[PDB]
Paper text:
Here, we study the molecular basis of the CO2-generating steps of anaerobic ethane oxidation by characterising native enzymes of the thermophile Candidatus Ethanoperedens thermophilum obtained from microbial enrichment. We perform biochemical assays and solve crystal structures of the CO dehydrogenase and formylmethanofuran dehydrogenase complexes, showing that both enzymes deliver electrons to the [name] cofactor. Both multi-metalloenzyme harbour electronic bridges connecting CO and formylmethanofuran oxidation centres to a bound flavin-dependent [name] reductase. Based on the crystal structures, enzymatic activities, and metagenome mining, we propose a model in which the catabolic oxidising steps would wire electron delivery to [name] in this organism.
The structure of the CODH component of the ACDS was obtained by X-ray crystallography and refined to a 1.89-Å resolution. The α2ε2 core of the CODH component can be reliably superposed on the homologous structure from Methanosarcina barkeri, also obtained from dissociation from the ACDS complex. While the α subunit exhibits high structural conservation with the homologue from M. barkeri, the ε subunit slightly differs due to local reorganisations to accommodate the ζ subunit. Each α/ε interface of the complex from Ca. E. thermophilum accommodates an ion in close proximity to the [4Fe-4S] cluster 3 (modelled as a K atom). In the structure of M. barkeri, the respective position is empty, suggesting that the additional ion may be a thermophilic adaptation of the enzyme to optimise the stability between the subunits. The C-cluster operating the CO-oxidation was obtained in a non-carbonylated state with the CO site vacant in both α subunits occupying the asymmetric unit. The ζ subunit is positioned at the intersection of α and ε subunits. It is composed of a ferredoxin domain in its N-terminal part (1–83, containing two [4Fe-4S] clusters), an [name]-reductase domain (84–349, containing one [4Fe-4S] cluster and the flavin adenine dinucleotide, FAD), and a C-terminal extension promoting the homodimeric interface (350–370). The anchoring of the ζ subunit to the α2ε2 core through its N-terminal domain offers a structural template to picture how the electrons from the distal cluster of the α subunit (cluster 4) will be transferred on the distal cluster of the ζ subunit (cluster 5).
Residue numbers in the entry:
A (entry chain E), D (entry chain B): 1 to 370
B (entry chain A): 265 to 789
C (entry chain C), E (entry chain F): 1 to 174
C-alpha cells in the first residue's frame, strides 16, 4: 500500500509497545507464532529474531495507518463524512430468527449475517470472539466452523480480545473462505494485512470484515474491581450492555447499572489514541447507537458489504428499515466526541508534524495553517 | 569414494576409480543430502559448520588436519579399533586423526559399518513437508533475497510451487552457491537450501558428467609444438578457466567459455572448481568437453591441469616457452621472463567465480609473471584491481630492443586484473586480452577474427575501438576484409585506398616484423 | 528503514540519502555533463525504453555488461558507448579522462538496471576516489544504493510496477 | 533550537537544491566559503567536504523551519494571527528627512531607522543590498558602515539577493553591532543562525533584523526579457514599484507599467513554496500594503523592534500614525493569498504528513482532522 | 542524522533506534528485572542524582569503573554493586548467572554515564551474545549508542542541559 514502512520487532517496541499505544489487536502475534507472545496485552519476544523486516511491524495498525489511502483501495473513494468515514447507506436492522435475536447483543445482525454466510457456503470459518470457561468473561478468539459455534460467540465482551489471532489460526488451518468480526482496531489490522505488499499470508481468503462500533475496551483488572465494588461476581454475569448513559450488568437476580462516565477510569491505555469510532474501514459496521432496543445500526461501506445486506434481507434472515436523521446524527455525535477527545491524547505523544520544511507540534497545527 | 573441492581432483589423479561430487557451491547440498555414510575432511574450502551438517545426517566426521579440529578429541594415538567403537556407538560425533594411515583405515572400516546403520534415514523434505514449506512462506519483500549473495527470488519461487509450479524453485539449484545465509533470516524456519534441492531432485540426480583427471605439467614436446604459433599469434592464446564457484548466474557460464574458445582453437586449460563445473554439461551429441576434445596442450584441446595447486603448471608452461622456444635463461631471472610473457605470450586467465584468499594470491602470482586475469562481478569485493588507461599514450610505451627507441603499442593486454559482469561481456574481453604487440600479421588476423566475431555474437556490435588492433591490411579478418577497409575509411576516417585494398594512414604504428618489444632497459642492445 | 540489497553492505558512516524521483531527475537536469550508466538488468521489464528516453534528452549512455545488444536490438545506439563497469569507474575518477566525446569528464553519474553488488562497488569507487573534481553518483534503480549519494529505497521485484512509476517520474523531471 | 536536525551538503542537496526549493537566501555560502559557491542562484560544491554535519544544512531556512518554536524563543509568544504572525502593533510611518523620503522605496522607513541606529552609535554596520554598476539592477550584498552607504542601498530590488552573504562578511570584518535588512526568507535564515545550538558564528552580534514584506522575487533573465518587450533598457531604469495591480518601471521619460499578473511568470521557483508574507520572524516588518503613497506599513514584533520605532519617533527621524481595520485587513488579505496559493505548491512536493501512527497526504489533512 | 560518538563505530546493519525518553522509561518499567549500568561519567553534572532516583525505584545499579566512590560519597550504596564493565557483560550473557541478588539474570540493561567506546562494546556484547534468553540493552546516556537496542541521539556536552531534561523525563516515566 502507499505510505508503507519497513520495520522489525525493535521498531515495533520503539514506536508502539514502549510508546504505550498497543491496542491488543493480536496481529503481530497472529503471524509470528515463532517468536511473539502476549503478556498483559502487549507483545513480547524471549529470543532474538533475525528477520530484516517483520510482519509484526507491517501488520500493526499503530506503526503506520494511511487511512485515506486504505479507503481508496477498499472503496475506490475517500470519506466525505469525517465522523463516520466512507459509507453508501445507514440503516437499522435486526435478526429474524428468534433464537439469534434473543442471544444477540442488540438485534443479532452480526450473528445472523455470519449464519447466512455459512449456511449458503460463502464462508467455511467465522473468526469471532468467545469467552473462557476458566477465567470468567475473559474473551478469546473463536474460529467458528458451525452455525452453533457462531451463536456461541454472540454478545458483546467489553474486554479487548486479540481477535486477529483467530484469523491467523483460520488461515493456517486450511479455511478457504473466511469472515471475521472486529472492533475498529481489529478491522484496521485485517485491512493492513489484506493490503500489504510486504507479506503474503493468504489474507485474500478473508472475504468479509464485519466491523463493530467501539468507544473503548476495559482493562480486565480494573473492570473486575469495578464489578466487586458493585458486589457482582463475574461468573454470575449473564450479559453486559452499555446504553441510556449506563453500564448495565445483567444477572439472574436482575440488572445492576452504573453511570457510564465512571467506567472511563477502566479503559485500556491503548484505546486513548484510537481515532476510529465507526469501524471506518470495514465492509459493514454494526452498532447500537441510533437504533431502538433490539435493533442494530448498520453502515454499508463496501460493495461486498452492500451485497451481503441485500442478500441477507432477501433470504429473510434480517429485517431492515430506514434510520431517521436525528438517529444518524446521534451516531455522528458519539464519533466526534471520541475522535476529538482522543486526538487530544494523540497530540501529547506524537512527534513533530512536518510539512516540507515546516515543523510544528501537532496540537499547534491550526496556528500554522489557520 | 568421492570428493568435493580439490581433494577430489587429487584423489582421482591417484585412483581413476574414485569420483568427484562437485565444486564448493555444491558442498552444502551434497552433505545435506545425507548420501555420505562417513565424511573425512582435511583443510581449506570446507564448510566451517561441517560437524553440524554431518551430525544432522548421522555421518561421523573424521578430521585429519590441525587447521580444522572443530572441537573434536585428538585420537591420533588411539587404536583404530577403539576409534571405530567410539564413532559407531555415537558417544562422539567425530574425531581428529592426524596420522593419515590410521585415518584411512578408520574411514574405510567405518563407512562399511555406517552404511548399514544409516539405511532407513530420510534427509531431504518429503513431498508433504515440501508442500507445507512453500505454503507457509510469507513471500517476504526483503528478507531471504536480501541475505542471499545472488539475490535469488526464493519467496516468489516458493509461492509458484505452492500454486503447483516447482520450475522456478528448481531453476535456483544451480544458481545457488550453497552458502546457507537465506535460511538464517527466515522466521518461518524454512530449510530453503533443502527446499530448492527437493524441487530440483530430478535434475540433481541427472547431474552425471565426465572429466579428465588432472594432468599436471605441460610436456616439453608440447611447448615446442605450440611455442611459435602462440608467440606469433596463430594459436590465438591460452585460455585458463580457474578459480572458485561464486558465480553470478550458475555453473554453465564457465562451460560456455571453455566451449566457445576450444571451438576457436584456443588452448583451453582448467583447474579447481572451474574444471569441475565445465564438465557438468553435454552438447547435442551427449558429450562433455573432456569427452569431445583431446587432453593435449595444443590448440583446440581441453586440459584439466589439476587442482588449485596445479595452477603453477600454467606459469611453468609460459616460462618453458621463454626458455625452450626463445632460449632465454630462467635461473633467478624473473623480470626478464615475466616481461617476455607480457609482450609475447598470448594468454588470459578467467576466475569467473573468484572467492577465496587463495584465489586472490593466485591472481597476484599470475599477474606478476605478465598474464592478465578476468574475474566475475563478485571480484569487486577484493577492493583492488589493475586497470589500464588505453587513452593515455605515455602509459603504453615499450622499447624496441634493437635500438632503444620507444614505440606506443595497442592496449595488449589492456587490463591486468579486471572484473566483468556477464558471460556476454566476459568472452569478448578474454579474446581482447590475448592481443600482444609481437603478433605477426597472420596471428593478429586470427585473434582479430575471433575478437570481432565474438563481439558481434555476444554484444551485437563490433567494439567501438577495434581498429586499434589493425597495423596493416594483412591484420584484417579475411572474409570481411573489404567491408572492414570501408568501415576504416568512412566510419573511422582512416586514409584507405579501397581500389588498391591498402591502408595508407590511421594505424597506431607501422608493422615491423623485427620489432623486439620489451619494457626492460637492460634488454636494449 | 533503508534495506541495502545485500544486508552486509554496510560500508561506512556516509550512507546514501533517499531522494524523490523528482529530485533525482533534477540532479541529472542540473548536471553540466551527466552520464547514464546501465547494466545487464536494463535488458528486462521494458527498462531499456526508459534508458532510451533519457538518452534522447541529450545524455550519453554507458552500456556496461552486454547491455549494448538491447540498444542495437532497440534501434537506439547514437550516443551510446560500450564499456566495462570496472574500466568506467577508473576512467570517471581520472580527472584527465576526456570522456566518450573527448570533451571532458562527467560531473553526474546515474546508475540504472545494474547487478547490485558490482554496481554498488562501482558507486563506492566514485564516492571515495572521485573527490576533486567531485563527481556525484546517484541511483535511479530499484535498489537502495547505500554507496550512492542519493538513491531510491529498495523496491522488490514483485513490485516492479511501482519502480517503473517512480523511474518514469525521473524521466519526466529531466 | 527545538526540532533541530543534523545534516550535511548531501542532505541539503537531497532536500533543498534538487527539490527546487532553494530561495537563494545566501546563508549556506555565507558560512562555507571553503566549499560552497553559487551558480544560477543555487549552491554547488566542486570538491568533497568531510564534516559529519554542516552549517549549510543547519542554517538553511528550507531544511527545517520550526516557525512557532522560533517565535517563542524570539518573542516569548506564538502567533494568534496565522496571516501576519506575532505582532504587538501595526502602524503606518514615513521618514522626516526629505533626502531619505525621496530616495526611499515608499516612505524611507528602513533607511531612516538604519541611519538613526548608526548616527546614535547603536550599530557600526548595516547588512543591506546594493546594485552592480556592471550588471544593471543586479542586487549584491552591501555592508554599509556610513549613512551615505545606507542611502545608496535605498529602494526595492525585485531580483533576489543572497543578502546573508553580507551578514557573513560583516561577522568576519570586526563589526560589533550589526543590523540586517531581509525579505522573509533572509530573516528566517538569520533567525536560524542566531538560534542554532550546533554552530557558533558570532551571530549574537546581529542586534536588529529588519524584515520587508514580500510576495515574490523575479528571475533575472525573465525579468529583463520583459524589460526588452517593454522597450526599456535596465541601464535607464531609475526605480521599480508594484502597486494598483501594476508593475511600474520608472525612467526619466516617465513610467512604463504592466499587469502584475503577467509578471507571475517571472517569479523564482524557490518563491513558490514560500509561506511567509509579512517577515513573521523579524524584529519589525516593513511594507507598503495598507499604507498610503509615501507611507510604510510597519508591524512591531520584538521588544527591540518596539524600542527601535519608539526611539526613532522620539528623535523625529520618522512620523508614526495609527492604521484603520480595513487597511490592516488589506495586509491580512494579501498574506492569506500568498499563503493559500503557496501551500498548494508546498503540498505538491511534501511527503506524507504523519500524526502518531496516522499518515495522510498533506492536502488531505482536513478529510482526516475535520 | 544519527551521529555515533565515534563516527567509525558503524558495526553492522542492525542499528540502534532513536527512542523518546518516555519509551525508554517505560521499557525499564516493563522489565521484570532491570539493571542500571553506570560508568565513570556519572561522577559529573549531578548525573548520580538521576542514577540514585532510578535505584530508589527498586532497581539495582551496577557501578562500573570507580563510580562506586560517587555512590559512597552520596550516601546511597544499597542495591548498588561494585563490578567491572567487562565481567558484567560476560555475566549478563551467561544464562546461568543469577545476578547480584542471586535470583536470576536481568532482562533489561540500561547504560548511563559511561565512557563511550567501552560502553558501546559492552552493549554490542549483549546485542550479539545475549540472545536466548534475550536481554534488551538500551541507552539513556548523552550518546547515540548504535549498539543499543533503543537510545537517544547525540547530545553534545555544551548542550548537557537538554540531555538532563530528557534524562529526567526517563526517570519520571519509570
Ligand atoms: C468492546 C465493545 C464496545 C462497543 N462499543 C459500542 C459503542 O460505543 N457504540 C455502539 O453503538 N456499539 C458499540 N459496540 C457494539 C455493540 O455492543 C454490538 O456488539 C453491535 O451493535 C453488534 O450487535 P449484534 O446484536 O449484531 O451482535 P451479535 O449478533 O451478538 O454479535 C457480536 C459479535 O461481536 C463479537 N465480539 C464480541 N465482543 C468482541 C470483542 N471484544 N472484540 C471483537 N469481537 C467481539 C462476537 O464474537 C460476535 O461475533 C461495542 C462492542 C464491543 C465489543
Ligand atoms: C522583492 C521585494 C518584494 C516586495 N514585495 C512587497 C509586497 O508584496 N508588499 C509590500 O507591502 N511590500 C513589499 N516589499 C517591500 C516594499 O517594496 C518596500 O521595500 C518596503 O515597504 C520598505 O520601504 P522603505 O521605503 O522603508 O525602504 P527603503 O528605505 O528604500 O529601504 C529598502 C531596503 O531594502 C533592501 N532591499 C532592497 N531590495 C532587496 C532585496 N531584493 N533583498 C533584500 N533586501 C533588499 C535595501 O537594501 C534597503 O536596505 C517588497 C520588497 C522587495 C525587495
Ligand atoms: S521474527 Fe519478524 S515478525 Fe517475528 S518478532 Fe521478529 S521481526 Fe517481528
Ligand atoms: S497494536 Fe496489535 S499488532 Fe500492534 S503491537 Fe499491539 S497487538 Fe501487536
Ligand atoms: S477504542 Fe479503538 S483501540 Fe480500543 S478496543 Fe475500541 S477500536 Fe480498539
Ligand atoms: S544458500 Fe543459495 S539461495 Fe540461500 S542465500 Fe546462499 S546462494 Fe542464496
Ligand atoms: S524469509 Fe522465509 S518466509 Fe520470507 S520469503 Fe524467504 S523463505 Fe519465504
Ligand atoms: S563543508 Fe560543511 S557547510 Fe560546507 S558544504 Fe560541506 S557539509 Fe556544508
Ligand atoms: S535556501 Fe539559502 S541556505 Fe538553503 S540552500 Fe538555498 S541559498 Fe542555501
Ligand atoms: S517569496 Fe519568499 S522565498 Fe521568495 S524572495 Fe520573498 S520571502 Fe524569499
Ligand atoms: K542480496
Ligand atoms: K569520539
Amino acid at each position: 500500500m502507499k505510505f508503507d514502512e519497513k520495520g522489525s520487532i525493535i521498531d515495533l517496541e520503539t514506536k508502539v509497545v514502549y510508546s504505550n499505544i498497543c491496542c491488543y489487536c493480536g496481529a503481530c502475534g497472529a503471524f509470528c507464532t515463532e517468536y511473539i507472545s502476549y503478556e498483559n496485552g502487549t507483545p513480547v519476544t524471549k529470543q532474538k529474531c533475525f528477520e530484516i523486516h517483520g510482519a509484526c511491524f507491517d501488520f500493526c495498525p499503530r506503526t503506520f495507518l494511511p487511512v485515506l489511502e486504505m479507503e481508496r483501495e477498499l472503496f475506490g473513494e475517500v470519506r466525505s463524512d469525517w465522523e463516520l468515514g466512507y459509507y453508501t447507506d445507514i440503516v437499522t436492522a435486526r435478526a429474524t430468527n428468534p433464537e439469534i435475536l434473543e442471544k444477540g447483543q442488540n438485534g443479532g445482525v452480526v450473528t445472523a449475517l455470519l449464519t447466512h454466510l455459512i449456511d449458503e457456503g460463502k464462508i467455511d470459518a467465522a473468526c469471532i470472539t468467545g469467552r473462557s470457561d476458566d477465567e470468567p468473561w475473559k474473551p478469546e478468539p473463536l474460529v467458528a466452523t458451525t452455525r452453533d459455534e457462531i451463536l456461541k460467540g454472540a454478545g458483546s465482551n467489553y474486554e479487548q480480545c486479540p481477535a486477529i489471532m483467530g484469523v491467523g489460526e483460520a488461515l493456517a488451518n486450511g479455511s478457504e473462505n473466511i469472515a471475521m468480526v472486529g472492533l475498529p482496531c481489529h478491522i484496521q489490522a485485517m485491512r493492513k494485512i489484506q493490503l500489504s505488499k510486504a507479506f503474503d499470508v493468504g489474507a485474500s481468503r478473508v472475504k468479509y470484515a464485519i466491523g463493530l462500533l467501539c468507544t473503548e475496551t476495559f482493562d480486565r483488572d480494573l473492570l473486575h474491581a469495578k464489578l466487586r465494588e458493585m458486589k457482582i461476581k463475574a461468573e454470575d454475569v449473564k450479559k453486559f450492555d452499555i446504553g441510556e448513559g449506563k453500564f448495565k450488568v445483567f444477572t439472574e437476580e436482575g440488572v445492576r447499572t452504573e453511570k457510564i462516565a465512571t467506567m472511563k477510569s477502566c479503559m485500556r491505555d491503548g484505546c486513548k489514541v484510537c481515532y476510529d469510532f465507526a469501524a471506518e474501514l470495514a465492509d459493514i459496521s454494526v452498532g447500537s447507537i441510533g437504533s431502538e432496543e433490539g435493533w442494530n445500526t448498520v453502515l454499508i461501506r463496501s460493495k461486498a458489504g452492500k451485497e451481503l445486506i441485500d442478500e441477507a434481507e432477501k433470504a429473510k434472515v434480517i429485517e431492515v428499515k430506514p434510520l431517521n436523521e436525528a438517529s444518524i446524527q446521534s451516531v455522528k455525535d458519539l464519533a466526534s466526541r471520541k475522535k476529538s477527545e482522543n486526538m487530544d491524547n494523540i497530540v501529547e505523544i506524537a512527534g513533530a508534524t512536518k510539512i516540507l520544511h515546516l515543523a510544528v507540534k501537532p496540537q499547534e497545527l491550526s496556528l500554522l495553517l489557520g | 569414494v568421492a570428493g568435493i573441492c580439490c581433494t577430489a581432483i587429487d584423489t582421482t589423479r591417484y585412483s581413476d576409480r574414485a569420483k568427484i561430487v562437485g565444486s564448493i557451491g555444491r558442498q552444502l547440498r551434497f552433505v545435506r543430502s545425507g548420501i555420505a555414510d562417513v565424511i573425512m575432511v582435511d583443510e581449506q574450502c570446507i564448510r566451517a559448520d561441517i560437524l553440524e551438517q554431518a551430525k544432522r545426517t548421522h555421518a561421523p566426521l573424521i578430521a585429519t588436519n590441525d587447521k580444522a579440529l572443530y572441537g573434536l578429541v585428538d585420537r591420533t594415538d588411539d587404536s583404530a579399533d577403539d576409534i571405530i567403537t567410539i564413532l559407531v556407538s555415537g558417544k562422539e560425533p567425530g574425531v581428529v586423526i592426524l596420522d593419515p594411515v590410521k585415518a584411512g583405515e578408520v574411514a574405510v572400516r567405518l563407512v562399511q559399518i555406517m552404511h548399514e546403520k544409516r539405511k532407513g534415514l530420510v534427509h531431504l523434505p518429503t513431498d508433504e513437508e515440501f508442500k507445507e514449506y512453500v505454503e507457509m512462506c510469507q513471500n517476504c519483500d526483503a528478507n531471504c533475497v536480501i541475505a542471499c549473495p545472488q539475490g535469488l527470488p526464493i519467496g516468489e519461487a516458493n509461492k509458484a510451487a505452492a500454486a503447483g509450479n516447482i520450475e522456478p524453485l528448481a531453476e535456483l539449484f544451480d544458481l545457488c552457491v550453497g552458502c546457507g545465509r537465506c535460511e538464517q533470516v527466515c522466521k518461518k524456519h524454512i530449510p530453503i537450501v533443502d527446499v530448492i534441492h527437493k524441487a530440483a531432485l530430478p535434475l540433481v540426480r541427472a547431474e552425471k558428467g565426465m572429466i579428465r583427471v588432472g594432468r599436471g605439467p605441460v610436456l616439453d614436446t608440447e611447448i615446442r609444438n605450440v611455442g611459435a604459433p602462440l608467440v606469433l599469434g596463430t594459436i590465438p592464446g591460452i585460455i585458463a578457466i580457474v578459480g572458485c564457484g561464486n558465480y553470478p548466474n550458475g555453473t554453465k557460464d564457465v562451460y560456455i567459455m571453455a566451449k566457445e574458445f576450444v571451438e576457436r582453437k584456443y588452448i583451453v586449460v582448467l583447474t579447481g572448481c572451474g574444471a569441475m563445473d565445465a564438465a557438468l554439461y553435454r552438447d547435442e551429441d551427449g558429450k562433455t568437453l573432456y569427452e569431445k576434445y583431446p587432453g593435449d596442450f595444443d590448440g583446440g584441446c581441453i586440459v584439466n591441469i589439476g587442482s588449485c595447486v596445479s595452477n603453477a603448471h600454467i606459469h611453468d608452461a609460459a616460462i618453458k616457452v621463454a626458455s625452450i622456444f626463445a632460449r632465454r635463461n630462467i635461473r633467478a631471472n624473473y623480470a626478464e621472463i615475466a616481461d617476455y610473457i607480457l609482450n609475447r605470450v598470448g594468454a588470459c586467465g578467467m576466475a569467473w567465480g573468484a572467492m577465496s584468499q587463495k584465489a586472490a594470491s593466485i591472481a597476484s602470482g599470475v599477474n606478476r609473471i605478465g598474464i592478465p586475469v578476468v574475474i566475475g562481478p563478485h571480484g569487486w569485493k577484493y577492493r583492488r584491481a589493475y586497470l589500464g588507461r588505453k587513452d593515455v599514450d605515455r602509459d603504453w610505451m615499450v622499447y624496441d630492443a634493437r635500438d632503444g627507441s620507444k614505440v606506443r603499442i595497442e592496449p595488449a593486454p589492456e587490463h591486468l586484473l579486471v572484473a566483468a559482469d556477464t558471460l556476454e561481456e566476459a568472452i569478448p574481453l578474454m579474446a581482447r586480452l590475448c592481443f600482444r604487440p609481437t603478433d605477426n600479421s597472420m596471428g593478429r588476423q586470427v585473434k582479430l577474427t575471433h575478437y570481432m566475431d565474438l563481439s558481434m555474437k555476444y554484444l551485437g556490435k563490433y567494439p567501438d575501438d577495434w581498429p586499434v588492433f589493425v597495423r596493416t591490411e594483412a591484420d584484417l579478418p579475411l572474409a570481411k576484409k573489404e567491408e572492414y577497409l570501408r568501415i576504416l575509411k568512412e566510419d573511422y576516417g582512416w586514409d584507405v585506398d579501397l581500389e588498391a585494398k591498402k591502408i595508407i594512414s590511421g594505424p597506431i604504428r607501422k608493422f615491423d616484423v623485427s620489432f623486439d618489444a620489451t619494457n626492460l632497459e637492460q634488454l636494449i642492445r | 528503514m533503508n534495506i541495502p540489497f545485500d544486508i552486509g553492505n554496510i560500508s561506512g558512516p556516509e550512507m546514501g540519502r533517499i531522494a524523490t524521483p523528482e529530485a533525482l531527475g533534477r540532479a541529472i537536469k542540473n548536471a553540466k555533463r551527466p552520464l547514464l550508466v546501465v547494466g545487464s538488468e536494463i535488458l528486462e521489464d521494458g527498462l531499456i525504453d526508459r534508458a532510451i528516453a533519457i538518452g534522447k534528452k541529450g545524455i550519453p549512455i554507458a552500456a556496461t555488461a552486454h547491455s549494448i545488444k538491447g540498444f542495437v536490438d532497440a534501434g537506439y545506439t547514437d550516443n551510446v558507448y560500450m564499456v566495462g563497469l570496472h574500466e568506467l569507474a577508473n576512467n570517471i575518477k581520472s580527472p584527465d579522462w576526456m570522456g566518450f566525446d573527448g570533451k571532458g569528464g562527467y560531473d553526474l553519474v546515474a546508475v540504472l538496471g545494474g547487478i547490485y553488488y558490482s554496481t554498488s562497488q562501482f558507486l563506492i569507487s566514485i564516492k571515495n576516489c572521485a573527490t576533486d573534481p567531485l563527481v556525484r553518483a546517484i541511483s535511479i534503480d530499484r535498489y537502495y544504493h547505500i554507496a550512492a549519494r542519493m538513491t531510491f529505497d529498495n523496491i522488490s521485484r514483485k513490485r516492479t510496477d511501482e519502480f517503473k512509476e517512480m523511474l518514469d517520474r525521473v524521466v519526466q523531471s529531466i
